[PDB]
């Protein structure tokens, strides 16, 4: 054995938030610096911040107060799966208080209009799209923030995320004081995980796309053409709460998860991820829900590894409508029409390494994943898997 050291103490515990409202990191924009909380989103590629009054914002970017502000005289429109905003392009000096000690000039979309984007009480005023330029709006010429960071400094072309779910509800006061995790910019901090790191190839550099080759519910093979699992793509997206699955995979997964938890009957609303279910304080029957394993393409030919999540991950802690002493949750898995989305739910159980430089993504058991005395999340390998390339989808 050999104890693993944490070498980025300055960035550890720099995140706050929760799966339901997103995780954010503190940033500064302009001269003098204007402090803002920014949603960490590996699912998009635009750096944008509120730049005008809004019901849900307590503060916003004030361009006229920044001596380093540069107007790009260009409008920008960004529509997500749900939620959208319109803004004005420009550049300015940007820093990360609890990150590498550097300042860089990056593109900034000043949000002037938005619909269903900002979330009441999230405590963040902007978003940080960490994905590639290919999906940046208006187009790939608008250099993403992390690209600017790497090109302008010596920070390694790599970042890692530790999203920490509490395992229980956090009120407004609590979510503000609580540590929500870590975003290590430029490296890997060994104190954030246990066990080994397994890497899966980044299939294509647009979203952080990966390939799932096998799915199990309590060790039982979901048994579908692996191509279904990646229809029309599979991405790692911290900007989305739930594990989202292709319609057919969702139907199969839900049927299998219900069968495994059959000793307990749950209403349709529950399975639709719409309504919560509650249990007497401390009695949540974790053991009746199955673990879910996702096999990922490995880096060696014909080799794969698997990540296993517990219901402590796919069941999201929520406060009871009557703020009682029950432990309540919602089913954090839902159907997609745009492929598989490995959201915050899934990320909370693992330390995820976005190794841009080696075009790969690493997974390791999170030092902060919620579990019980009987089961734990896992990252295991290797497995002999054939024709994995066939699992990828092509239009
Ligand atoms: C996160 C807190 C709760 N929310 C949002 C509020 C209900 C979700 O769980 C959620 C649910 C769905 C169902 C989509 C998105 C969604 O679109 N997330 C965005 C970011 C985001 C947007 C927003 F409005 C509010 C947020 F908090 C976070 C990702 O970038 C999507 N990546 C794929 C994609 C898909 C289409 C276009 C695209 O452009 C890059 C990227 C987010």
From Swiss-Prot:
Inhibited by RTN3 and RTN4. Disulfide bonds join 164-368, 226-391, 278-328. It is a single-pass type I membrane protein. N-Glycosylated. Addition of a bisecting N-acetylglucosamine by MGAT3 blocks lysosomal targeting, further degradation and is required for maintaining stability under stress conditions. It catalyses: Broad endopeptidase specificity. Cleaves Glu-Val-Asn-Leu-|-Asp-Ala-Glu-Phe in the Swedish variant of Alzheimer's amyloid precursor protein. It is found in: Cell membrane; Golgi apparatus, trans-Golgi network; Endoplasmic reticulum; Endosome. Belongs to the peptidase A1 family. DXXLL motif is required for a proper endocytosis and retrograde transport to the trans-Golgi network, as well as for regulation of lysosomal degradation. The transmembrane domain is necessary for its activity. It determines its late Golgi localization and access to its substrate, APP. This is Beta-secretase 1. The lineage of its organism: Eukaryota, Metazoa, Chordata, Craniata, Vertebrata. The gene is BACE1. The chain holds residues 55 to 447 of 501 of the full protein.
């Amino acid at each position: 054995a050999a104890g693993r050291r944490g070498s980025f103490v300055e960035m550890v515990d720099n995140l706050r938030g929760k799966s339901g409202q997103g995780y954010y990191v503190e940033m500064t924009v302009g001269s003098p610096p204007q402090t803002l909380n920014i949603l960490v989103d590996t699912g998009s590629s635009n750096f944008a911040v509120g730049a005008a009054p809004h019901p849900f914002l307590h503060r916003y970017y004030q361009r006229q107060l920044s001596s380093t502000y540069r107007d790009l005289r260009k409008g920008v429109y960004v529509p997500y799966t749900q939620g959208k905003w319109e803004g004005e392009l420009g550049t300015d000096l940007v820093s990360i208080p609890h990150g590498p000690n550097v300042t860089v000039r990056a593109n900034i979309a000043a949000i002037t209009e938005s619909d269903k984007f900002f979330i009441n009480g999230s405590n963040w005023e902007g978003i940080l799209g960490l994905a590639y330029a290919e999906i940046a709006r208006p187009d790939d010429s608008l250099e993403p923030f992390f690209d600017s960071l790497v090109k302008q400094t010596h920070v390694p072309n790599l970042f890692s995320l530790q999203l920490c779910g509490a395992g229980f509800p956090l009120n407004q006061s609590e979510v503000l004081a609580s540590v929500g995790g870590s975003m290590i910019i430029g490296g890997i901090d060994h104190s954030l995980y246990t066990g080994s790191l397994w890497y899966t190839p980044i299939r294509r550099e647009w979203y952080y796309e990966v390939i799932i080759v096998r799915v199990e519910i309590n060790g039982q093979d979901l048994k579908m053409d692996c191509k279904e699992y990646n229809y029309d793509k599979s991405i790692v997206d911290s900007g989305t709460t739930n594990l989202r699955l292709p319609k057919k995979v969702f139907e199969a997964a839900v049927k299998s998860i219900k069968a495994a938890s059959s000793t307990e009957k749950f209403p349709d609303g529950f399975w639709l991820g719409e309504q919560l279910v509650c249990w007497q304080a401390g009695t949540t029957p974790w053991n009746i829900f199955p673990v879910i394993s996702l096999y990922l393409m490995g880096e060696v030919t014909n080799q794969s590894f698997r990540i296993t999540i517990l219901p402590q991950q796919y069941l999201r802690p929520v406060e009871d409508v009557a703020t009682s002493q029950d432990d309540c949750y919602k089913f954090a898995i839902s159907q997609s029409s745009t492929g598989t989305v490995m959201g915050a739910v899934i990320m909370e159980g693992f330390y995820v390494v976005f190794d841009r430089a080696r075009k790969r993504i690493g997974f390791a058991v999170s030092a902060c994943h919620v579990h019980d005395e009987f089961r734990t999340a896992a990252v295991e390998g290797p497995f002999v898997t054939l024709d994995m390339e066939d699992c990828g989808y092509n239009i």
